């Protein structure tokens, strides 16, 4: 309620005998979430995956390795109407907050 009340709670008594009693502490935290990572530059080549016209047949599906890059999965909603988007492994939407 007031400094006198927490002073009484610290001494565990309803009376005070004219002293300087250490009661509590103080802090401040109005904001957070400042710049974390540097310029995202080396994007993963999702252009030659979702925009490539020449796709191989299902019996001879292509195998393309994606590594050493930043996978901006937000571009999937651009190069395709995301009709049958279904993530069976981790999460459909929670995909940019984890790494492999």
């Amino acid at each position: 309620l007031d400094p006198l009340s927490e002073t009484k709670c610290t001494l565990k008594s309803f009376t005070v005998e004219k002293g300087i009693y250490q009661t509590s502490n103080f802090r401040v935290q109005p904001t957070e979430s400042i710049v974390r990572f540097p310029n995202i530059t080396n994007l993963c080549p999702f252009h030659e995956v979702f925009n490539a016209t020449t796709f191989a047949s299902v019996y001879a599906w292509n195998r393309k390795r994606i590594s050493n890059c930043v996978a901006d999965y937000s571009v999937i909603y651009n190069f395709a109407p995301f009709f049958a988007f279904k993530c069976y492994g981790v999460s459909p939407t929670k995909l940019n907050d984890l790494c492999f």
């Binding site: 400094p3 927490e6 009376t15 005070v16 004219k18 300087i20 009661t23 802090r27 935290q29 400042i34």
Partner: protein, 291 residues
């Protein structure tokens, strides 16, 4: 959260000169106090925002209810009706007066508070009254009178002798728990021996303080010694325990979960008799019986 480095503090434009590969800065305490932005190569300083035990300056609830707080170690600009910036921290609830008085409630470096016209006020304590000694190469001052002043000094002698049972306090009338206590070694033996040593030490302290006389001296029937009145220190037979009025005031003004309190070897009557013997000796023998 610079590159995963989590923390909380102030970020100011730093004048440090890092190296192209360095990203963080540490002090002798292995604490990160300087960091660089990942996008811009500008260096920033990390200082703790604010923390300090707020001491509520209280003049006692028996007098009044107004209180004052002291945010120790922080300015008045980072706090959420008088506000004054003392060198010990921001003080809220007491104004600073230019007059100097005796230090009543210690507030910090040279600042003390008191309940005076009411409201709480802070000021610079005065070390004493100014006295200009009129020195001269031929001036002397000789006292023409005197004043017999009886001063009091209070010094503790002994503590309360206590002894605690190890197993009965830790577990308590238990068997499955007492078996695990044996695995802890002889820690129970150390505490008991330490408490017995403390007890015999308090007994020895009482003996060395009060039992300095080899015999017990008593005063003759009270007569006119020289005009001095020792009735305040001499015991009286009209009151039990044979304590003087001063000793009476001293005595008046000043479950077992495995722990017990041991009674003193010398009771309150034996110490009273030792004090009466010391007094009777120093009033009829002076410094002679002590030698």
């Amino acid at each position: 959260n610079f590159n995963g480095l989590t923390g909380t503090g102030v970020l100011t434009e730093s004048n440090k000169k890092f190296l192209p590969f360095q990203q963080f800065g540490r002090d002798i305490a292995d604490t990160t106090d300087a960091v660089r932005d990942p996008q811009t190569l500008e260096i920033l300083d990390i200082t703790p925002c604010s923390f300090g035990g707020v001491s509520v300056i209280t003049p006692g609830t028996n007098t009044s209810n107004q209180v004052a707080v002291l945010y120790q170690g922080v300015n008045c600009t980072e706090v959420p009706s008088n506000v004054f910036q003392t060198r010990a921290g921001c003080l809220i609830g007491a104004e600073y007066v230019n007059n100097s008085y005796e230090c009543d409630i210690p507030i910090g470096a040279g600042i003390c508070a008191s309940y005076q016209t009411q409201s709480i006020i802070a000021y610079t304590m005065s070390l004493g009254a100014e006295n200009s000694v009129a020195y001269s190469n031929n001036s002397i001052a000789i006292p023409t009178n005197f004043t017999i002043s009886v001063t009091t000094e209070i010094l503790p002698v002994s503590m309360t002798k206590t002894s605690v049972d190890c197993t009965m306090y830790i577990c308590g009338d238990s068997t499955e728990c007492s078996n695990l206590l044996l695995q802890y070694g002889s820690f129970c033996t150390q505490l008991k021996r330490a408490l017995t040593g403390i007890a015999v030490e308090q007994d020895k302290n009482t003996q060395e303080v009060f039992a300095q006389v080899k015999q017990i001296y008593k005063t003759p029937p009270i007569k006119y010694f020289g005009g001095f009145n020792f009735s305040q220190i001499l015991p009286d037979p009209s009151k039990p325990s044979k304590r003087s009025p001063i000793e009476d005031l001293l005595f008046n003004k000043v479950k077992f979960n495995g722990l017990t309190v041991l009674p003193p070897l010398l009771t309150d009557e034996m110490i009273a008799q030792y004090t009466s013997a010391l007094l009777a000796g120093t009033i009829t023998s002076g410094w002679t019986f002590g030698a």
